[PDB]
């Protein structure tokens, strides 16, 4: 009951909550477009490995473990070992940047270093240089960086200067120091840079430094580790990582696995399907995840994205920190990072390593196939779990860097793409995070893969990215991505949802980049859109029309292609579409087509005039969206027509005069926004948007189930309670009628009103009185007498309110007002004018004034008056329905709708009583007339009896009941005299009787007279369902009478 009371009826204006929601968007966080792509060009390897010579401060020897680059120099001798080690160092660096320029010095002195640095600077003056200093054979550094370089005589220590080194390499640069007291060098470096800056007031911000350990500590002398531990960690992330694992673990959990097998693990570092390949992939994923989840974005983008070598070195640095911590060394870097050895992700690494190694023995011994770990599957699972309920007010997922890695392979790509799509379906903030990690440059590569099954995923992802970030610098039209989407659109078997998203994408890239303008013609996009104009789906119709409108902007080639194929011939058929959004899209595309085609004029002036007149027909549409678009489209045509209006406007102040009349009509039409624009067009001539509303749709969630289906939401419990309340009030009204109607000598309301209360109406359930005078509507509390705010209708001066009605019982309870000039306005909150009148619409009918009767069971507005016909509009489509012809030669005072018999009920000013049957052919809907009257007929209506007998009153006062199927009457009552219409309320069996005197001669439905009741009459009315009268008087007051 509570639902059906109002939800068996159309709610005509629910769309009005969205039609005007025209908006743009906020700015985007800057920026994923990492334009700064500075790179490393050359590497200088400076070795001081003076094999066979121990500086005097060396403590020796048993645990010295003098293993360098996995070489033991004692087995080769002082010269072979040095060259061999240098070769291995070169190989270790080539694994990370094979294109680097190689430069090497073995025991250089002074001029050798100056010349090296100068030559490298000359090779690339703007790019980065890496300077790697070993120092193992050199005494502990001093504040100046003194080094044991000499002509094979140790007594020539040669003091050096960090300041001078900075001078030689003034370019952006990266320094690596393997010195014992390495931090001392960094401190001196910074102090000298400051000194130089101060001297320049009469390089600090460009250098990156990695030091093995702090200035106050020495590198460990451990018999089982390589001497060059820091270098090994930075250049060979595996190897030592596994050796450490074997040594560090207190109690091994994998019996039988030791170094003898670790050094026999097969495979290439880059062979993704081997043990080492998988381990390198996992290592990279973990170290990137830690960096993402620890550092601020300002550092993350600079260190892990701008340069391949910098990112690799810092990625390995985190490992060096973790390992060297256990030996009382603290690696030092500049810029300084927060500590990371505490992060939980390192436990995952150890687990993965443990799992791998348990298979190593048998694979070596028996040759069993290698099985892959579940690492990425579990990480994807955890992400999927997070997605269960994501909100903005939460920490972002910690695993986005893992998804990025998964997308690079061909095993879990489909799952990662699905989960990414689901993530991106959240509001715009979700997209920004995805952009900040670098999905974009990878999905651009996936866009051109040979796979076909990926189509709906790449389409969805790109639809969301473009919906949020349309600024992408033409990447989809510089490369072949646009061709992909054209093919996607072409596929006749793809679901409409994806065709719609593809059409959206194409519209965006065409209007956004101004380079896709030729490509969309090379692929015959126009032909595809024209074929697709007949698609039944509303959104494909809208977006295809938008694509065509956007194509026909400033193209010369598809000015000609447009005219050549008579594209407009098909677009105007969309002007018949029941849905106003499609009509708006069609008006946009058609107006743009002609406005731009007219630049040639030539023979196309034939088209120019015809379209102008086809648009003229749309003045009858009634929709404010279509109407506004009509005004804009006409203005676009006016731009071209002004060349001839310069000699036509003088007449206004023969298609030109028709256009003048159309624009004048549109200006006159009661939509001030439209009127204003139309007047600006008319004035401009005399003196001399929708696409964004539609576009914002795709930025919303679409996988979300709307609140309307949430059976526990407060909005449902509250609305249902209020619905029951209203129903119970109706029941109270029924009970007071059923208990018996007595003389109406009780009182409810008396208040002084503004103006003359000529129209008095009440809400079906809510005790609120709505009374109109000529110009304005006042409102009152039906029971308390409290005065409510009034609302001036806003109609032109000298107009008059003719009729008022309510449209729905509970939810869409709008107040509709009709006037003599045809204006029909609807407002949502007569109920709450104190805070927001909330105007709904402002239609105009009748192309007696205006009399209306809207059919709530059908959603139809019926109107008559000074047109001599009956007009029907579909208020659920914003479209004219029909003009109903009549043989009458006079106007009417009626009208009344009979929704159960499809009958139009009138009395006529010519004295006859005429009714119409909506089912008859529209030549004349002749059913009756009745011919027992000659004087004008006043308000008439049908009785509650199933037969459909009609009550009709003459201006002479005669009251007569007529037979619904014969021209003869049923009876004559003569209840009242003289010219008094009978307002009857069948539910209450009450008959009102107004007069020139200050009283109402109330009768019962039986015709019996009750002595005149007092609390010139202006208006008679009844509160629906209640046996209570209301009368307005020409003394500026209204009153309400009640059963005693």
């Amino acid at each position: 009951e509570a639902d059906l009371t109002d939800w068996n009826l159309p709610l005509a204006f629910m769309k009005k909550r969205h039609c005007e929601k025209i908006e743009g968007s906020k700015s985007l966080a800057q920026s994923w477009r990492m334009k700064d792509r500075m790179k490393t060009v050359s590497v200088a390897l400076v070795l001081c490995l003076n094999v066979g010579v121990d500086p005097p401060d060396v403590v020796k020897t048993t645990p010295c473990a003098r293993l360098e680059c996995w070489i033991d120099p004692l087995s080769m001798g002082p010269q072979k070992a040095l060259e061999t080690i240098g070769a291995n160092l070169q190989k270790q660096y080539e694994n990370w940047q094979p294109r680097a320029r190689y430069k090497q010095s073995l025991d250089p002195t002074v001029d050798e270093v100056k010349k090296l640095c100068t030559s490298l600077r000359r090779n690339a003056k703007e790019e980065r240089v890496l300077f790697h200093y070993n120092g193992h054979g050199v005494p502990r550094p001093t504040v100046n960086g003194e080094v044991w370089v000499f002509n094979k005589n140790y007594t020539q220590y040669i003091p050096l200067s960090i300041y001078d080194l900075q001078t030689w390499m003034g370019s952006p640069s990266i320094f690596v120091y393997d010195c014992s007291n390495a931090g001392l060098i960094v401190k001196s470096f910074k102090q000298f840079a400051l000194q130089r800056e101060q001297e320049l007031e009469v390089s600090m911000k460009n250098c990156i430094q990695l030091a093995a350990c702090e200035a106050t500590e020495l590198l460990p002398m451990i018999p089982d580790l390589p001497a060059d531990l820091f270098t090994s960690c930075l250049t060979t992330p595996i190897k030592i990582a596994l050796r450490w694992f074997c040594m560090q673990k207190c109690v091994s959990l994998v019996p039988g696995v030791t170094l003898d097998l670790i050094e026999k693990i097969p495979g290439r570092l880059n062979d993704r399907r081997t043990p080492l390949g998988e381990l390198n992939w996992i290592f990279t994923a973990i170290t990137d995840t830690i960096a993402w989840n620890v550092l601020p974005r300002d550092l993350f983008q600079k260190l892990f994205r701008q340069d391949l070598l910098v990112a690799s070195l810092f990625r390995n640095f985190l490992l060096a920190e973790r390992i060297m911590r256990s030996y009382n060394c603290t690696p030092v870097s500049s810029p300084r990072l927060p500590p990371t050895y505490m992060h939980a992700m390192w436990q995952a690494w150890d687990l993965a390593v443990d799992i791998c190694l348990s298979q190593l023995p048998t694979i070596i011994e028996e040759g069993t196939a290698f099985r892959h770990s579940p690492f990425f599957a579990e990480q994807l699972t955890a992400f999927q779990v997070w997605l269960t309920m994501g909100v903005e007010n939460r920490n972002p997922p910690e695993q986005l860097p893992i998804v990025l890695q998964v997308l690079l392979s061909q095993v879990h790509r489909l799952r990662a793409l699905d989960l990414l799509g689901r993530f991106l379906d959240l509001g715009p903030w979700a997209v920004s995070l995805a952009l900040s990690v670098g999905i974009f440059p990878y999905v651009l590569k996936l866009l051109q893969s040979s796979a076909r099954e990926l189509r709906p995923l790449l389409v969805f992802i790109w639809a969301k990215i473009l919906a949020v970030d349309s600024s992408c610098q033409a990447d989809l039209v510089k490369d072949n991505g646009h061709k992909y989407f054209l093919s996607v659109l072409a596929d006749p078997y793809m679901p409409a949802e994806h065709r719609t998203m593809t059409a959206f994408i194409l519209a965006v890239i065409v209007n956004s980049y101004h380079t896709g303008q030729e490509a969309c013609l090379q692929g015959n996009l126009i032909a595809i859109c024209l074929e697709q104009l007949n698609d039944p789906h509303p959104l494909l119709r809208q977006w295809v029309a938008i694509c065509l409108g956007r194509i026909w902007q400033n193209f010369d080639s598809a000015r000609w292609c447009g005219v050549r194929d008579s594209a407009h011939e098909k677009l105007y058929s969309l002007l018949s579409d029941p849905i106003p959004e499609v009509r708006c899209a069609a008006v946009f595309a058609l107006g743009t087509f002609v406005g731009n085609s007219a630049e040639r004029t030539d023979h196309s002036t034939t088209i120019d005039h015809n379209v102008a007149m086809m648009l003229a027909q749309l003045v009858s549409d009634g929709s404010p969206m279509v109407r506004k678009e009509l005004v804009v489209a006409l203005s676009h045509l006016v731009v071209q027509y002004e060349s001839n209006f310069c000699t036509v406007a003088l007449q206004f102040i023969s298609v030109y005069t028709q256009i003048w009349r159309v624009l004048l009509h549109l200006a006159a039409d009661p939509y001030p926004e439209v009127s204003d624009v139309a007047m600006k067009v008319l004035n401009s001539i005399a003196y001399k948007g929708f696409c964004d509303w539609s576009a914002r749709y795709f930025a919303q969630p679409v996988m979300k189930i709307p609140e309307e289906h949430d059976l526990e939401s407060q909005i449902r419990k509250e609305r249902e309670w209020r619905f029951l309340r209203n129903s119970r009030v109706r029941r109270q009204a029924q009970q007071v009628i059923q208990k018996g109607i007595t003389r109406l000598d009780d009182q409810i309301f008396l208040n002084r009103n503004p103006g003359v209360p000529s129209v008095v109406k009440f809400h079906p359930f809510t005790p609120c009185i709505a009374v109109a005078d000529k110009d304005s509507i006042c409102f009152w509390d039906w029971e308390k007498g409290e005065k409510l705010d009034y609302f001036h209708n806003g109609n032109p001066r000298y107009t008059r309110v003719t009729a008022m009605e309510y449209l729905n019982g509970q939810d869409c309870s709008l107040l509709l007002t009709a006037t003599d000039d045809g204006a029909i306005r609807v407002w949502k909150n007569f109920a709450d004018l104190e805070k927001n009148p909330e105007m709904v619409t402002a239609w105009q009918g009748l192309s007696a004034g205006m009399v209306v009767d809207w059919e709530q069971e059908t959603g139809l507005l019926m109107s008559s008056g000074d047109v001599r016909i009956v007009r029907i509009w579909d208020t659920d489509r914003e479209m004219k329905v029909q003009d109903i012809p009549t043989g009458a030669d006079s106007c009417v005072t009626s009208l009344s709708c009979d929704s159960h018999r499809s009958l139009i009920v009138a009395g006529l000013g010519d004295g006859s009583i005429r009714v119409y049957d909506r089912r008859m052919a529209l030549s004349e809907c002749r059913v009756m007339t009745y011919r027992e009257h000659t004087a004008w007929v006043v308000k008439a209506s049908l009785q509650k009896r199933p037969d459909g007998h009609i009550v009709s009153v003459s201006v002479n006062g005669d009251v007569r009941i007529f037979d619904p199927r014969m021209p003869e009457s049923v009876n004559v009552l003569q209840i009242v005299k003289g010219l008094t219409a009978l307002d009857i309320h069948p539910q209450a069996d009450l008959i009102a009787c107004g007069s020139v005197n200050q009283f109402t001669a109330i009768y019962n439905s039986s015709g019996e007279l009750i002595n005149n009741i007092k609390y010139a009459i202006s208006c008679l009315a009844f509160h629906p369902h209640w046996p209570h009268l209301a009368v307005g008087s020409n003394d500026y007051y209204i009153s309400v009478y009640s059963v005693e």
Binding site: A311, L407, Q410, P441, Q448
Partner: peptide, 8 residues
């Protein structure tokens, strides 16, 4: 181009 290789 890309920092990481893709098995396109």
């Amino acid at each position: 181009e890309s920092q990481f290789e893709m098995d396109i």
